[PDB]
Curated annotation (Swiss-Prot), chains A, B:
Localisation per UniProt entry: Cell membrane; Postsynaptic cell membrane
Known partners and oligomeric status: Homotetramer or heterotetramer of pore-forming glutamate receptor subunits. Tetramers may be formed by the dimerization of dimers. Can form functional heteromeric receptors with GRIK4 and GRIK5. Interacts with KLHL17.
Phosphoserine modified-residue sites: S159
Gene field: Grik1
Higher taxonomy: Eukaryota, Metazoa, Chordata, Craniata, Vertebrata
Protein name from the UniProt record: Glutamate receptor ionotropic, kainate 1
Residues the entry annotates as binding L-glutamate: P85, T87, R92, S138, T139, E187
Tissue expression pattern: Expressed in the olfactory bulb (at protein level). Expressed in subsets of neurons throughout the developing and adult central and peripheral nervous systems. In the CNS principally in the medial amygdaloid nuclei, medial habenulae, pyriform and cingulate cortices, and Purkinje cell layer. Also highly expressed in embryonic and adult dorsal root ganglia. Expressed at high levels in the trigeminal ganglion neurons.
Modified residues (Phosphothreonine): T195
Miscellaneous comment text of the record: The postsynaptic actions of Glu are mediated by a variety of receptors that are named according to their selective agonists. This receptor binds domoate > kainate > L-glutamate = quisqualate > CNQX = DNQX > AMPA > dihydrokainate > NMDA.
Residues in the Extracellular compartment per record: 116-254
Family named by the database record: Belongs to the glutamate-gated ion channel (TC 1.A.10.1) family. GRIK1 subfamily.
Protein function: Ionotropic glutamate receptor that functions as a cation-permeable ligand-gated ion channel, gated by L-glutamate and the glutamatergic agonist kainic acid. L-glutamate acts as an excitatory neurotransmitter at many synapses in the central nervous system. Binding of the excitatory neurotransmitter L-glutamate induces a conformation change, leading to the opening of the cation channel, and thereby converts the chemical signal to an electrical impulse. The receptor then desensitizes rapidly and enters a transient inactive state, characterized by the presence of bound agonist.
Disulfides per UniProt: C199-C253
Residues of the full protein shown: 447 to 820 of 949
Glycosylation sites: N200
Length: 254, 254
């Protein structure tokens, strides 16, 4: 009866709450995605247990084409929903069922302020500034699969030297941008959150693609359509907008 | 199989081609949506027969909850697909199925350049400049249903005086903006198209909301998921972006 919700720590979507005593169960967590789940639970009338994905991955395929991460949890019916910044992509939609998007976004560039760099092609025609993405995430996959010239050049650079330009996670990418001469290809909603908090960083250029985050369900799940309708309701009522402004607003940067 | 596709004339989605002799069948039409249908038909391997919706409407409910337009064609299984700038909304998703969005947009304001107006709250707080939307479209319905104070205010104004501030169609709205002191609340992708072609008009403010256009199918159709997967493929390949640029780009503005 109670639904199992797979998710992953990622600021400001899902974070451990701060407290002076050990926390248990759903009380461990806060964030945009917990607020979304509370609003979805309200509308649809389910109870839920939040479970962190045991392997700490979003969802990609190994050499055998077996999935991992939140995507695999859904496939195997070890979770009923995945509520996280899980990008809606062609390869994932073949294997699980996403709701319609609760957030739309695109890949863009995180870099330091004050420089002459203005676009992905400024990066691509040069080698002094290093640049990369989180290994095996949807942004990397976009560069890997692209047949657009500029993105191909960029993939050749990223993948070169046993992928030394890639990072394991966004926090590693951020620190590399802050310390060295490095630009991170990152989803725009995460760039917005980061630039609101570190005033030496900025987004470079616009969005190079367009995509959404959606709630994952196993293929065939009856919850996919109920959740899509509830998301559309929350969007039209201004509630998704309110939730984004609650979690993104920073107060310290020009 | 040959699919039956319901659609509606709307620039630059679906337009009559120019020819010195009469045109027949699918050859009557061109535009972004025809290009999309060709790409979907190449991926999924169907033939198709394009039919203009007989009542010339997108789809809205009357007081008795009865539907019209392309939505009613799908509900009644008179068409297999609706391919048009058909906004994905809560009320429509309850009665038909949409693919994931092939375009993502929001309501914004079309107005003349060179004025002090910068946002919907600027319009809401006054009564001198008239403003409205296409009657019974998804933009009107957004305002009708909103409980956000600004938008309630705007709906009270739009709906006053026997809805004299509303218009029957987008071209009527565009002419009214060009001639009189009037602002049109319009989906942002159409404002883009218009302002590329009318250098005296501009978008005012940003997007008020976030929504998409999707291919519509009857509820339960097996094509909906196939078309979603095909749209995601076309997005990731950059084809949807190239299709938008092809149909939107104008001759330039001074
Ligand atoms: C935080 C990361 C690893 C996730 C979030 N959305 C993408 C995904 O769902 O693959 C990944 C980011 C990226 O690839 O830029
Ligand atoms: C062109 C119009 C009448 C359509 C297009 N999408 C909206 C729909 O699908 O309702 C309507 C526009 C709007 O309401 O601003
Ligand atoms: Cl857990
Ligand atoms: Cl698997
Ligand atoms: Cl026809
Ligand atoms: Cl969907
Ligand atoms: Na799917
Ligand atoms: Na539906």
């Amino acid at each position: 009866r109670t639904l199992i919700v797979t998710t992953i720590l990622e600021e400001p979507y899902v974070m451990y709450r701060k407290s002076d005593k050990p926390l248990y169960g759903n009380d461990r967590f806060e964030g945009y995605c917990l607020d979304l789940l509370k609003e979805l639970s309200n509308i649809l009338g389910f109870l839920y247990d939040v479970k962190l994905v045991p392997d700490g991955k979003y969802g990609a395929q190994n050499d055998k084409g077996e999935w991992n991460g939140m995507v695999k949890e859904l496939i195997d019916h070890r979770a009923d929903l995945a509520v996280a910044p899980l990008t809606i992509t062609y390869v994932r939609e073949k294997v699980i069922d996403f709701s319609k998007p609760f957030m739309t976004l695109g890949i863009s560039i995180l870099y330091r302020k004050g420089t002459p760099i203005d676009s992905a092609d400024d990066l691509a025609k040069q080698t002094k500034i290093e640049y990369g993405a989180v290994r095996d995430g949807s942004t990397m996959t976009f560069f890997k699969k692209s047949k657009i010239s500029t993105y191909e050049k960029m993939w050749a650079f990223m993948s070169s030297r046993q992928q030394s330009a890639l990072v394991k996670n966004s926090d590693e990418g951020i620190q590399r941008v802050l310390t060295t001469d490095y630009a991170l290809l990152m989803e725009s909603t995460s760039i917005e959150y980061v630039t609101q908090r570190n005033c030496n960083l900025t987004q470079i250029g616009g969005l190079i693609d367009s995509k959404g985050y959606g709630v994952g369900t196993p293929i065939g799940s009856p919850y996919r359509d109920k959740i899509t309708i509830a998301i559309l309701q929350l969007q039209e009522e201004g509630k998704l907008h309110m939730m984004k402004e609650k979690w993104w607003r920073g107060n310290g940067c020009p």
